[PDB]
Design a binder for this molecule. Structure first.
Ligand SMILES: Nc1nc2ccc(O)cc2s1
Lengths: 109, 109
């Protein structure tokens, strides 16, 4: 049993199955429209999204890390920010793509 | 030369060189004692730390993602939490190791 953070979503084991329903609560992810949720790393523009995901070294190097204990369990918390390069020729498209998936679930029928 | 989020710290390119000095401010990292800062992914217990880092799929599946536009540019924000396995026989050691590195910088120059 690989832990949740090591899972990879695909068409046969999708974002909802691996990582739960999209939503606004603290423990929920909010990222992905219906196409990305159904397809995971098979999504047509997945590489353009993954360019922004951190390496293990960067995850622990760039982030503010903490530990919290709640009734549900013991949690390693993380927060940070990643600058988009507005000198990148593909900047405008990167922004459009990220905004299409952030909080997409709010307009799901 | 690589974007910050794709860098890999090592003895040749250490945590300070790759990710900046440890400290408390936003986008500043707070994780690592003197030994980890110097060695990065060559640190003896690096695998026991990296087991908690997310895959690219998990990062975008589990996290709360946002986009903050400020005078310095456009920033992709992330926040989330990784649950430790309370039934793992090494749970107690995992807690000790993470706590050893969180805010370690407060105790040395
Ligand atoms: N509702 C949630 N369950 C889990 C389980 C494991 C994990 O690492 C994060 C979460 S958020």
């Amino acid at each position: 049993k690989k832990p949740r953070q090591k899972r990879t979503a695909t068409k046969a084991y999708n974002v909802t199955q691996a990582f739960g329903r999209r939503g606004p609560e603290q423990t929920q992810g909010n990222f992905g429209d219906q196409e990305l949720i159904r397809q995971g790393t098979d999504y047509k523009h997945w590489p353009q999204i993954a360019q922004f995901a951190p390496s293990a070294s960067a995850f622990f190097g760039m982030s503010r890390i903490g530990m919290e204990v709640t009734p549900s369990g013991t949690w390693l918390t993380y927060t940070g920010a990643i600058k988009l390069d507005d000198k990148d020729p593909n900047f405008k498209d990167q922004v459009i793509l990220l905004n299409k998936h952030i909080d997409a679930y709010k307009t799901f029928p």
